[PDB]
Design a protein around this ligand. Sequence first.
Ligand code: S9S
Length: 185
Amino acid sequence: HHHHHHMVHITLDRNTANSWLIISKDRRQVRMGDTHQNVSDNKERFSNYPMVLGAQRFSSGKMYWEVDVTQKEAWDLGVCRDSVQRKGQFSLSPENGFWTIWLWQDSYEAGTSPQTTLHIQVPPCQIGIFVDYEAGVVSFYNITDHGSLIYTFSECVFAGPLRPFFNVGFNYSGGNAAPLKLCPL
Ligand SMILES: CS(=O)(=O)NCCc1ccc(F)cc1
């Protein structure tokens, strides 16, 4: 790929965070806390999962950013509609307004309904996410493996503004405490 030059500076929106998340002062890192983080509830917060949105909203153009997933056992990454459901249980699918991939139990999968098996030879430590709003494309790149393609969603129905989407995953095992980090340009 040669998408790096559509690089955008993403920051995390604390107001949208699950109440157990800890977002760094620079709003570029997020991790699962070991308790409720002493914030009030609001209608924007994801209630059931350790999810948070980026502050940026996109309705046009080409956008690219990178995320560090080093030493995590579980996470979800991608984009979603600004209007996605925040409360209760739901599945990550384009029908529900999500364009995502994940790591879970030593397998990588794309968030289609049902999920799609990914084929990655080099486990990634950093993921690139590319959105072409006009083309209806969301693509994922393996930065650890020379930028090799992981997955492309095409013919996307964004149906409104998009926000960067993150899930740090649960830490039931004690092996998934590490943060998601937005990588410098
Ligand atoms: C730190 S942990 O060992 O992963 N425990 C998770 C508890 C929890 C459950 C649902 C949430 F929406 C947020 C947190």
